[PDB]
């Protein structure tokens, strides 16, 4: 499992490089901390119009102006 | 069918905002900051009514508040704004990233002479709540009543009377 | 519109250069010549290997046709599913390649 | 063929039929038919002889034409309905195209002209698959689109299929072509009762698959492909002699055997709907199938017996062949008629 | 004249199939199908289907019709044709193709305008630019959704392509 | 119905009539079959782009890929025929008359 | 380097999209008046 | 005004292809310890004009063609696809600015094998047909890794736009995160155009005259210059000031000349592959590494949160 690895690195380095790159491409998106930021950036990219809501009277988490405190903020994206 | 009720030409006339798209894109973030309320009441009326014929006057309110946005730039800070939208206007894709010193001059002169804060990255894409006095549409699709569903099955399931009733099979 | 004009101009320049290349030396009255290669009168034998590499091109080209919208699919919200299906398509292209390997399909044009 | 590759290809055939059976979308119907054809093409070429390549070429041409006509019917449905649910079709042009395409995939007449050829070109197990498993997916689509199937067209195809599958069985000594014309006649029987009671369609399908599988399993157990080669069964394995022929007496449609179970039930659903002439004509043609297949029964259980001397050597060796489910399928293809009201499980 | 251009291409498209459904040769059949693929691709591209038109070129024409011409060229043993000096070897080609465009322009006659003008599409047919879409081709995002939404579709498609490789390698063996 | 759809259907039926009257070769049959597939691609694409139905835009590519794989299968069948007789003639494919 | 620059380009894409979002009420109101202008003109010329 | 722009693209392409023959013969001269042409013009500057006037009045071979139409449509298609590959190339702004210029170029280069195939069948020779089938098999083989390498690189771009590819590389060259893709791309473009050491046609279109051979020749060299410019844009993308586009134009011109002379310097250095050895190079060396790097450049912007913008 180690002498076989040295043998296949001696005979066929192309397939060893291919299986190593493919194995890292499989495992490393889960072992990474920055993978969640890909999800967050792709879900915070505004392709549509943010259709507003009628104010029924009791919605504390929804702002009234873009320059309000509450609302989803992208301080993490500006700073990183 | 019924005659579609299109409004008259006099009910459509308004004072247009006759500026080009680079003028609008250079003046976009401050317009989203300062002209928030009639814009969101109009687009709430536009997605609730699903009909522009009932969204006319609020739309004119947009076209009443956009011009007063630009006049207040024209009285105070027309020259940094002109120097900014000219550099916006040069580019093919109209990049914000090519015009940062003219952006800083326009934001500085606007924050001084008018006090407008350019919004942060992430804020203009927010879903906001809108307080209106107009009613909620009870049927925006103008749909008629649904046909009544079939009566469902109920009751305890009894065995079949004398089996299958298939010619001579008694079970 | 500009693309159609450009294609038409490229086609016109191509046909013009071909027409000049055929009609300009046919001004010459040089010689009418007679008496018409590694085979003289042999038929063509078919080769199975050339057809195998053609069909291998076609099947991997279909797999590439599936792989083509990936720079657009990177922008989606369901990135875990998108990554799983992208890796699954490239893995199935690799499994097709390994099956082409081990059954001696890539031999004498390896 | 590599047996792992054989298992993978057979599971792909089953997967294509299952994708046609379970899908609510027309593109997946088309995908399942494409997968089914693509995977069944090496099953025909298991032996690598020119008759299998000819059979696979004819099968590819007919099933590909049927697949393209199916996709044109799907496209015209998307015109006149804007949607993709596997339900009734919203244009009788798309209905006629899908009915013609499914009749081509089943090999119903007048698109029957590939069924006795291809079944002749391929081995007995691949012919078994072609005449049992490949019926299941187009009959499932016909089960799911019957509010749009034209009555006159499906009855025309049904009675033409029964007449041509009847008159195809005269001039044949090949067992595989006789099973192919029996296939054509039974598909006419199945699509006769489709717009009246599709439970009897599924009953006819299940009884047909059981009888066809019993017959092909007997043909594989004896390795006989012609009538004249079937005629030596009495001297080699005498228990094999009659089971073929009581199963074929079932396949004609003859009481008290269970092959009388479909046709009678079909008549039992067509005299309800005030059609008296049409089941009368179709079952007179079934008696014509009895005529030719009873002549084959006379050929094997009686007159044309005589053996050759090398048969004496076959007496010193039993059948080591897998006769898989052959007693079960032989019991289920004859003695099922006293359990005829089991058909309610197919609703 | 310029308005009816998609319709014009469609007419040429129909005529293109009459180039090879009459079947003069499999090689000229492939040539007519390549020309028909190009003009049907023009029909696709003129509704804003840019990616689908480039799949016609890249996968149908440059991917599959290359293989059809390749397999055809490994069959159907060739023979020479007329090879006189330039009054035959290119002049007959130019007069024949000018007669082909004469046939293309020749069908737009009084029997055509009774169908064109009574059922005028151009003016109200090509409606792909009906309003705004945004910062994205809707057709591009619909093809992009093959990976997030089309999980079962990609599974059965990749399985069919793997089975296609296996099936071709089993039937093209002879053993 | 509509006009350009009628043209694409006309091409489909013309390549069908070419696919239903064989002259000499099996390659002519495969070419008419793939002209049918091409017309199915064109007509599906124009419907899907017309209605702005977004998720079906992957459908013609699917309709391409499978069917192109289908064509590959057909080409391989032709090759095996041309390895037995030397030509791809459909009149060499008549041994299954008996 | 591609990490930092693709992240910065995503922030620029969000800035351009917020410019679009801030302009969409005016463009939608002008689009509504555009189509109602043209349909009233088509109605009057249809009536004459 | 647009036709002026089309002519100012297509006439300098033909002039650059004409003088590429001079640059090739001079650089292959000095690398082979000899001189290249210097007698005809001053330092050889009239050798392309003399060669062109020689080839365009040379006798046609009176070709025994198996077809008229494919014999004419193979040089026509060769020149048309040689010219139309240039129209989306951003220099820094292309002739046809299209959203899918990369995919357009991949499609129009995948259509370029029909000139080879129609030149092969339009000859009566079975040997020329066998050579054409081998060339077609080689070219469609290497188009696979063209497509996969090109897709893997454009996973860092965001879209198939060639002008966006200039915006992508404003901070770093794209050869730094993608040099294995760069070197396999470069050998794959070397093997597309049947360029040495992949030139087994000199180891199919000889049925033609010398004039139509000059047409196939100049289409091949336009493809060489075009793929060098496309590789320059794709991996060594230059700085661009929108107020002075000549900085980008001189910069990618110098890089394109260096990469074309790198083709000229590869062809004067190596022996040819045997045919199965370059099929081994594609199907058993470049294709596993290329698929692994395709998986890598899919899954890498997801794990590094470096997913490029769509627009
Ligand atoms: C539910 C529907 C099920 C339908 C049938 C499923 C199986 C058929 C397909 C697979 C197959 O070929 O299996 C072989 C098949 C036998 O068929 P065969 O090869 O033709 O038999 C030849 C000899 O019997 C072989 O003899 P042997 O010398 O090899 O050794 C004895 C052998 C050894 O077997 C064992 O050892 C089995 C026990 C171990 C199982 C595995 C454990 C791990 O025992 C048997 O095979 C005895 C026969 C078993 C009965 C076969 C038919 C079953 C009933 C089918 C449905 C009938 C419906 C009638 C309805 C009528 C009214 C409509 O089945 C088995 O071997 C296992 C039977 C399991 C029965 C489970 C029943 C309940 C299911 C719920
Ligand atoms: C405290 C806890 C413990 C308490 C214990 C309590 C029980 C103790 C006794 C345990 C054993 C019970 C056995 C079953 C009960 C009696 C069933 C019965 O006789 O039904 C009369 C049944 C109708 O008469 P019934 O007067 O209306 O009913 C009197 C009872 O109340 C019948 O009552 P039902 O209203 O329930 O009747 C049900 C219904 C009544 O039937 C109907 O509603 C009409 C459907 C009948 C079938 C018509 C089909 C016609 C076309 C196909 C003909 C095929 C060829 C015929 C056979 C040829 C040779 C294989 O039956 C069916 O639908 C099923 C089909 C008939 C099966 C009968 C049971 C057979 C079991 C053994 C089979 C052995 C092979 C026999 C021959 C195979 C064919 C039957 O008779 C017939 O249909 C005649 C056929 C022969 C009947 C089988 C006699 C059973 C014993 C046979 C032993 C000897 C076998 C010799 C070797 C093999 C043959 C060569
Ligand atoms: C931009 C790229 C390059 C473009 C092409 C190069 C530019 C110049 C093109 C024209 C070159 C001159 C004409 C072709 C060469 C003629 C050579 C030749 O053998 O001529 C004798 C031929 C025939 O001469 P002959 O009558 O002695 O025939 C010789 C053959 N025997 C004796 C057996 C019968 O002359 C011609 O055919 C006349 C051609 C035109 C002459 C010039 C007219 C004006 C042209 C402007
Ligand atoms: C072998 C198959 C390997 C891949 C299996 C599916 C992986 C996956 O992404 O699943 C989640 C996906 C989708 O889940 P999701 O996580 O994308 O859900 C989010 C909701 N949508 C899709 C609307 C954005 O699939 C399923 O949940 C069901 C489909 C797969 C069912 C199993 C297929 C097996 C085929 C064997 C042959
Ligand atoms: C002659 C033997 C076959 C006759 C079978 C008829 C049985 C029956 O129910 O007849 C009523 C049916 C009539 O069906 P019907 O009852 O629906 O008739 C119309 C309804 N009334 C009577 C109220 C107006 O008779 C037939 O269909 C006769 C034709 C039988 C089929 C053709 C036989 C050809 C020769 C063999
Ligand atoms: C874009 C601008 C240009 C780019 C650069 C290109 C310019 C330089 C050109 C030089 C001249 C080329 C002449 C022709 C070349 C043709 C021959 C040739 O070289 O064939 C290719 C050769 C072929 O090798 P071969 O032919 O010797 O192999 C023999 C094979 N067997 C034994 C089976 C017979 O090499 C390759 O295929 C390699 C390609 C590049 C690989 C890059 C791998 C990067 C590293 C990955 C990770 C590895 C470690 C493992 C994981 C570690 C993790 C930490
Ligand atoms: C799980 C991650 C994703 C994996 C899938 C994606 C992979 C991308 C690359 C695809 C490659 C497709 C083709 C692979 C075929 C493998 C079989 C093979 O090539 O066997 C033959 C070979 C012996 O060489 P030979 O036969 O002589 O070659 C002819 C020329 N001389 O035999 C060999 O050379 C041995 C080759 C197999 C063993 C290689 C081991 C590499 C290990 C690298 C480090 C660990 C990586 C982690 C994953 C484990 C991978 C095994
Ligand atoms: C609402 C209902 C829904 C549907 C219900 C279910 C429908 C089932 C339809 C079954 C169709 C089965 C077709 C045949 C099996 C498929 C695989 C196959 O062919 O296996 C046979 C196998 C092949 O072995 P091989 O080595 O190739 O033999 C040839 C000589 N060398 O081995 C042999 O050849 C050995 C010989 C015996 C093979 C017997 C196979 C019988 C299978 C069918 C059983 C009956 C049907 C299922 C039960 C009733 C349901 C209808
Ligand atoms: C043997 C015959 C002669 C051989 C030599 C000549 C023919 C072969 C060589 C030339 C090939 C022609 C290719 C024509 C289409 C190329 C693809 C294409 O149009 O892509 C560009 C573009 C898509 O990009 P995108 O940015 O999305 O579009 C603008 C959106 N804002 O889309 C557009 O810009 C669309 C522009 C309008 C549509 C153009 C339609 C062209 C005419 C129809 C096809 C003509 C060729 C037919 C025969 C082909 C034979 C191979």
How is this structure best described in words?
This is part of a larger assembly, with 8 protein chains of 8 kinds. With 80 residues, chain A is mainly α. Chain A has 4 helices and 1 strand; from the N terminus they run H-H-H-E-H. Chain A has helices spanning 3-11, 13-27, 35-43, 75-79; one strand at 53-54. In chain A, helix 1 (3-11) crosses helix 2 (13-27). The longest helix of chain A is centred in the N-terminal third of the chain and has 15 residues, at 13-27. In chain A, 15% of the residues are buried. Chain B is mainly alpha-helical and 171 residues long. Chain C is an all-alpha fold and 110 residues long. Chain C has one domain (1-110). Chain C contains 4 helices and no strands. Chain F has one domain (1-86): Helix Hairpins (Orthogonal Bundle). The longest helix of chain F has 26 residues, at 59-84. Chain F starts with a helix and ends in a 14-residue tail after the last helix. Bound molecules: cardiolipin (2 copies), 1,2-diacyl-SN-glycero-3-phosphocholine (4 copies) and 1,2-Distearoyl-sn-glycerophosphoethanolamine (3 copies). The site of one cardiolipin has 5 residues of chain D, from loops.
Structure keywords:
part of a larger assembly; 8 chains; A: 80 residues; mainly alpha; 4 helices; G: mainly alpha; rod-shaped; binds cardiolipin; binds 1,2-diacyl-SN-glycero-3-phosphocholine; electron transport; complex; NADH; proton pump
Instruction: State which percent range the strand residues of chain A make up.
Output: under 5%
Number of domains of chain D: 1
Q: Give the overall silhouette of chain A.
A: rod-shaped
Q: What structural category characterises the helix and strand content of chain A?
A: mainly alpha
Enzyme class (chain H): translocase
Transmembrane segments (chain H): 2-22, 68-88, 100-120, 147-167, 172-192, 210-230, 246-266, 287-307
GO molecular function, one term (chain H): NADH dehydrogenase (ubiquinone) activity
Catalytic activity (chain H): a ubiquinone + NADH + 5 H(+)(in) = a ubiquinol + NAD(+) + 4 H(+)(out)
In short, what is this structure?
Chain A is mostly helical and 80 residues long. Chain A contains four helices and one strand; from the N terminus they run αααβα.
What is this structure's SSE topology?
This is part of a larger assembly, with eight protein chains of eight kinds.
Chain A (H helix, E strand, L loop, with lengths): L2 H9 L1 H15 L7 H9 L9 E2 L20 H5 L1
Helix pairs in contact in A: 1-2
Chain D lengths: L2 H20 L3 H19 L5 H32 L10 H15 L8 H7 L2 H9 L3 H10 L5 H17 L7 H18 L5 H25 L4 H4 L2 H4 L2 H14 L7 H11 L6 H25 L9 H4 L11 H7 L15
Chain G lengths: L1 H46 L1
The complex binds cardiolipin (2 copies), 1,2-diacyl-SN-glycero-3-phosphocholine (4 copies) and 1,2-Distearoyl-sn-glycerophosphoethanolamine (3 copies).
One 1,2-Distearoyl-sn-glycerophosphoethanolamine sits at the interface of chains H and E.
